[PDB]
């Protein structure tokens, strides 16, 4: 009878039919991602196209229910998410062309190879070939070749596609009444008509930038310390005042400085807090890694992994004959089917990833009760922050010692404290300017602030200004260095990694308070704390049923992202780095370049 009662009926039909269409689309995607074949890629596309058609039908049907005449928040939020037009606002030819560009960029990235000029059959792929060089190599020339060949063979290929992608994506966004595609992406954080809990898309830029200014001093000190350590590692190649050469940062882009730990470890003679060798010495396998991660969640009150998780997950590389996509992924197929796809290596980085991804699975298991459309994290940063919560605890020396990866005679010194925080800062702090500058570039490109003839010019001026990282070789406008990173060429927003980083320390602070933890936040392990587990579960089971400003407030008591807990976590390291850099330069000159002479 009423418009709300009518919408409720419509959503009951939707929730009913969505179960099978979504599960068949997800299962096909799973069967392709674990057994890459032409038969499986077509099956994945067939099921995915059926899901998209259902979503486009239900979207146009949801339009006749004005969400203004809706009082029930649960039905209003489901209707709000369904009546989003998105890509369907484009003409048939433009939707076809845009999907063509998206698939072409995705396959150029996943199949792009750098080759020997005199032996074209001898080639390397990004994963594992070029990524192994960037993670382990100590030779400046080899790292420079791997870095420049990636950006030259593959990045140059993506450039014309990216130019076309921004045009169509902007047409799609402007037809949906957004300023541009960047504004469209910032809509994930937007909350409206909720007094006291509202959040605008423009507020995200102001908050990210205001927060970043407070990060700046900790980063500059971390950057200066690393720069001094890198001068020992690569003599004659680094300036004491200049930026850090882009090819020497631990990975293909410098997204994380994690692999610089061997080169920058504060106290090398102390028992290693990188248990990667202790795992290898103890003959740990991916099953032990995953069973150990499962034991962590059970200890805080959460459930064991389902039988189907242990039956259907792919926790190792199939490698020979059966080829798989090795990006660590947590799958919520629906119908109570949860799986993890990850080609686990016996490393501490993968041990921490197993905890991160099972945290994603735990969030999925928790909000499964919610209606279909509300089965997601409060915002894009929620799922990523939750996995990182698990890593923060898993990584502590207190935790590694309790699980056997650190000798029972391990003594926590003030030096092991700095060894720990430095390792954490390389990953967590090191990625914040990289992430901010990456999105800032896209936002400006989508806005129209950077003309095509200055894309790469601005990318490297921003890398030198914001990140303090400088291209080892000059790049003209035939390159597209942003697209040489997965999220850029695979159409994923990147600011989730910046917001999740800040949320994780707010949640960790709240969770340790629940666990009656005494002492520094970095010495906290929420293991064997059901109080902390309950506080987390009450937020996990909520999904998207409450606005993120409210969802965050229910756990941390703040309706907005805050940099204070992140800074308190790294306080001992900040005061240490300050003294280490007493006779060092803190900051960088954007004029020095490895190729200047």
């Amino acid at each position, epitope marked *: 009878s009423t418009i709300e009662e009518q919408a409720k*009926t419509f959503l009951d*039909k939707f929730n*009913h*039919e969505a*179960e099978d269409l979504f599960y068949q689309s997800s299962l096909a995607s799973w069967n392709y991602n674990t057994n890459i074949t032409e038969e499986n890629v077509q099956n994945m596309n067939n099921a995915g196209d059926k899901w998209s*058609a259902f979503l486009k039908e239900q979207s146009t049907l949801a339009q006749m229910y004005p969400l203004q005449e809706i009082q029930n928040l649960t039905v209003k939020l489901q209707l709000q998410a369904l009546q989003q037009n998105g890509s369907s606002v484009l003409s048939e030819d433009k939707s076809k062309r845009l999907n063509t560009i998206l698939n072409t960029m995705s396959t150029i990235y996943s199949t792009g190879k750098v080759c020997n000029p005199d032996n074209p059959q001898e080639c390397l792929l990004l994963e594992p070939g070029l990524n192994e060089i960037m993670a382990n190599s100590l030779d400046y020339n080899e790292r420079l070749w791997a870095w420049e060949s990636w950006r030259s063979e593959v990045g140059k290929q993506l450039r014309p596609l990216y130019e076309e992608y921004v045009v169509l994506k902007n047409e799609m966004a402007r037809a949906n009444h957004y300023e541009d595609y960047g504004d469209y992406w910032r809509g994930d954080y937007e909350v409206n008509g909720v007094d006291g809990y509202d959040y605008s898309r423009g507020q995200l830029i102001e908050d990210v930038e205001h927060t970043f200014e407070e990060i700046k001093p900790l980063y500059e000190h971390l950057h200066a310390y690393v720069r001094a350590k890198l001068m020992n590692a690569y003599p004659s190649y680094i300036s004491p005042i200049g930026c850090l050469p882009a090819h020497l940062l631990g990975d293909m882009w410098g997204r994380f400085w994690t692999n610089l730990y061997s080169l920058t470890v504060p106290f090398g003679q102390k028992p290693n807090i990188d248990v990667t060798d202790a795992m290898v010495d103890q003959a740990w396998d991916a099953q032990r890694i995953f069973k150990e991660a499962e034991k962590f969640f059970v200890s805080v009150g959460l459930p064991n992994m389902t039988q189907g998780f242990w039956e259907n997950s792919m926790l190792t590389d199939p490698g020979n004959v059966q080829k798989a996509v090795c990006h660590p992924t947590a799958w919520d197929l629906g*119908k109570g089917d949860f799986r993890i796809l990850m080609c686990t290596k016996v490393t501490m980085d993968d041990f921490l990833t197993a905890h991160h991804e099972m945290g994603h699975i735990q969030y999925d298991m928790a909000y499964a009760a919610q209606p279909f459309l509300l089965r997601n994290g409060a915002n894009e940063g929620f799922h990523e922050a939750v996995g990182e919560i698990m890593s923060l605890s898993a990584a502590t020396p207190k935790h590694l010692k309790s699980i056997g990866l650190l000798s029972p005679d391990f003594q926590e010194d003030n030096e092991t404290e700095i060894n720990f925080l430095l390792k954490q800062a390389l990953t967590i702090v090191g990625t914040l300017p990289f992430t901010y500058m990456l999105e800032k570039w896209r936002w400006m490109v989508f806005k129209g602030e950077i003309p095509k003839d200055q894309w790469m010019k601005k990318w490297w001026e921003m890398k030198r200004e914001i990140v303090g990282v400088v291209e080892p070789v000059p790049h003209d406008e035939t390159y597209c260095d942003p697209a040489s990173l997965f999220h850029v060429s695979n159409d994923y927003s990147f600011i989730r990694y910046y917001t999740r980083t800040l949320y994780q320390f707010q949640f960790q602070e709240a969770l340790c308070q629940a666990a009656k933890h005494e002492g520094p936040l970095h010495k906290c392990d929420i293991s064997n704390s059901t109080e902390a587990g309950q506080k987390l579960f009450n937020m996990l089971r909520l999904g998207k049923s409450e606005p993120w400003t409210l969802a965050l407030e229910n756990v941390v008591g703040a309706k907005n992202m805050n940099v204070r807990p992140l800074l308190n976590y790294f306080e001992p390291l900040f005061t240490w780095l300050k003294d280490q850099n007493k006779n060092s330069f803190v900051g960088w000159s954007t004029d020095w370049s490895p190729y200047a002479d």
Partner: nanobody
Amino acid sequence: EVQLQASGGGLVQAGGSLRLSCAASRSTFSTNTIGWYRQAPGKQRELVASISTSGNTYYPDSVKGRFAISRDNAENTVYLQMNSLKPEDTAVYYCNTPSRRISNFWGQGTQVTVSS
């Protein structure tokens, strides 16, 4: 290899009972949601019952407590048991999957006439 054809409809007295059958292929039966629709000559199509692969069912208030959608795994058939029929239920009945509904692929319908 043509599936989703409705059958079993005929002439029935008021307050009577009738059972429609929907023959589906094993591949479609096992992976698709199956729904029953009806259309009065002149009026629009109306979903009367729906059943997921897990057995979850959906019925509108117009037929709640009177109609029953079932799945027989042995014969890959979806049945619509209609009890306490009325002249308002006089329509041609079709069975379909949500994806075939969107792509407008409609099979054979069965005319159900309910006498006063």
